[PDB]
Amino acid sequence: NDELEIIEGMKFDRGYISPYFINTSKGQKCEFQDAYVLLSEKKISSIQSIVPALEIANAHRKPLVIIAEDVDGEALSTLVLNRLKVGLQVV
Amino acid sequence: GQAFRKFLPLFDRVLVERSAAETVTKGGIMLPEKSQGKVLQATVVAVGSGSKGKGGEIQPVSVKVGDKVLLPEYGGTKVVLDDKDYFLFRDGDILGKYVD
Amino acid sequence: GQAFRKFLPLFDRVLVERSAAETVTKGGIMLPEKSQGKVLQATVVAVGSGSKGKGGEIQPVSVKVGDKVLLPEYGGTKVVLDDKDYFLFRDGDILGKYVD
Amino acid sequence: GQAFRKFLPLFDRVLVERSAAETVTKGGIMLPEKSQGKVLQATVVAVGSGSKGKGGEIQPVSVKVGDKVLLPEYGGTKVVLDDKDYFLFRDGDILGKYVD
Amino acid sequence: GQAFRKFLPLFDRVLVERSAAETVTKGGIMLPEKSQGKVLQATVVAVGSGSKGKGGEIQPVSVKVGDKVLLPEYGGTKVVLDDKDYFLFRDGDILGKYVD
Numbered sequence: 001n002d003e004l005e006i007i008e009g010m011k012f013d014r015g016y017i018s019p020y021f022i023n024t025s026k027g028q029k030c031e032f033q034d035a036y037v038l039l040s041e042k043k044i045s046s047i048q049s050i051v052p053a054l055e056i057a058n059a060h061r062k063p064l065v066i067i068a069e070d071v072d073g074e075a076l077s078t079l080v081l082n083r084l085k086v087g088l089q090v091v
Numbered sequence: 092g093q094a095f096r097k098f099l100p101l102f103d104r105v106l107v108e109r110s111a112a113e114t115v116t117k118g119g120i121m122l123p124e125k126s127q128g129k130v131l132q133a134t135v136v137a138v139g140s141g142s143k144g145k146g147g148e149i150q151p152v153s154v155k156v157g158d159k160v161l162l163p164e165y166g167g168t169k170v171v172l173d174d175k176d177y178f179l180f181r182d183g184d185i186l187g188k189y190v191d
Numbered sequence: 192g193q194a195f196r197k198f199l200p201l202f203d204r205v206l207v208e209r210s211a212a213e214t215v216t217k218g219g220i221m222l223p224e225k226s227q228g229k230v231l232q233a234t235v236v237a238v239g240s241g242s243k244g245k246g247g248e249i250q251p252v253s254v255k256v257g258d259k260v261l262l263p264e265y266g267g268t269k270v271v272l273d274d275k276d277y278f279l280f281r282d283g284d285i286l287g288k289y290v291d
Numbered sequence: 292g293q294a295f296r297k298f299l300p301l302f303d304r305v306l307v308e309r310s311a312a313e314t315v316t317k318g319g320i321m322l323p324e325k326s327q328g329k330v331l332q333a334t335v336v337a338v339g340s341g342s343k344g345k346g347g348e349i350q351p352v353s354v355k356v357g358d359k360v361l362l363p364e365y366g367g368t369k370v371v372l373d374d375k376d377y378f379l380f381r382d383g384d385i386l387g388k389y390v391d
Numbered sequence: 392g393q394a395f396r397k398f399l400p401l402f403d404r405v406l407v408e409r410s411a412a413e414t415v416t417k418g419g420i421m422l423p424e425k426s427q428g429k430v431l432q433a434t435v436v437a438v439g440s441g442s443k444g445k446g447g448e449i450q451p452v453s454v455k456v457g458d459k460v461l462l463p464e465y466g467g468t469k470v471v472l473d474d475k476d477y478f479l480f481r482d483g484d485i486l487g488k489y490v491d
Contacts, residue, residue: 097489098488099487099489100487101485101487102483106487168486
């Protein structure tokens with residue numbers, strides 16, 4: 001049968017970089033409410049460029065979604081480590 | 092000269108111990124163990140007897156055991172005492188000294 | 192020697208602070224923050240005790256804290272004190288001194 | 292030492308000013324501004340205090356302000372005073388001196 | 392100078408013997424004979440007469456036969472005495488000395 005699907009909001013067809021950020025088992029989704037959004041035009045590589053955003057997010061106890069050109073090894077390692085060992089809400 | 096764990100530097104060499112690297116920022120952000128690299132803060136644990144590079148009588152080393160020093164980022168010789176790592180520099184290589 | 196923020200240079204090393212770079216021309220034209228590069232104007236913040244390169248007794252450093260100096264464009268060691276950046280040179284590397 | 296525009300060379304350094312390049316030949320032929328290159332005629336504008344390379348007491352610089360000198364073609368450090376360009380050499384680098 | 396097996400070092404050279412490498416860990420694990428490489432623990436077996444690098448009268452060597460020393464990882468000259476291997480260093484190359 002034919003179907004009609006309505007897509008609302010802003011859907012841009014890009015997935016999570018690492019499976020470690022998933023926090024919802026049913027459906028394999030990373031879901032957050034009242035999240036900060038960090039928009040980066042250029043690639044994020046170094047730990048200095050990424051740590052301040054994590055500090056700001058953790059100070060206010062809010063999740064953080066980082067939309068960027070790409071995330072490199074050092075920053076990604078910091079993100080996954082903090083998410084796994086602290087429960088930091090990041091994606 | 093002043094010995095340390097039965098080891099005595101020769102001439103103007105100084106044996107120092109590097110401080111522990113930071114693992115958590117001033118906030119709550121923890122750091123990967125591969126990102127700290129090398130730290131330039133050290134404490135002097137052993138001192139040699141005197142400088143052979145001085146003409147005539149040899150001069151004493153300019154630092155004393157227990158001082159906190161700022162090291163260069165390129166020098167140092169690795170030694171192991173009681174399975175702990177210490178670094179041997181020349182008295183002229185130490186960049187600076189901290190005071191309290 | 193004269194200390195600064197609990198840091199003391201050794202021998203004939205001099206610790207200096209670089210001046211702030213220009214951001215607006217003498218007119219109203221502002222400059223990109225990537226174009227200023229490095230400035231060769233500095234102020235002396237700390238001085239060592241004396242030169243080890245002099246035979247016999249060591250000689251005092253030729254500059255005093257507070258002087259304004261013209262630095263070379265290739266030397267200098269980076270140090271951090273209270274999260275601010277300072278540069279460590281040798282007393283013989285300083286190109287010139289300004290007077291008022 | 293003798294200062295110039297509030298600038299004083301250190302040790303045995305000499306600050307000199309290059310002469311203006313020729314723009315018209317002895318006849319009526321004018322020369323492109325890209326062809327003159329660099330001129331080796333200079334006038335001494337500032338002199339340092341003394342040579343650190345001499346053992347014992349430091350010796351005075353061998354030239355005085357106002358002399359006309361023949362410089363080498365490979366050395367010199369560029370400095371700017373009141374937006375005018377001056378060149379800093381070592382006292383031993385100056386090739387020759389002119390007399391009247 | 393003190394001889395050893397009818398061999399006498401010249402000037403400030405020191406002849407030392409390397410210690411035997413570990414073959415079994417502190418537990419029961421044995422190690423391949425190709426993995427130990429080179430050991431930096433040595434015992435002094437012969438000492439020279441004095442340093443030719445000192446101006447004027449020559450100075451005696453700073454170590455005595457029987458001392459245990461920590462050697463550098465890059466120097467040393469190979470010699471054979473009674474089919475056993477010994478290593479010849481300069482008195483200034485020895486990194487450190489052990490005491491009991």
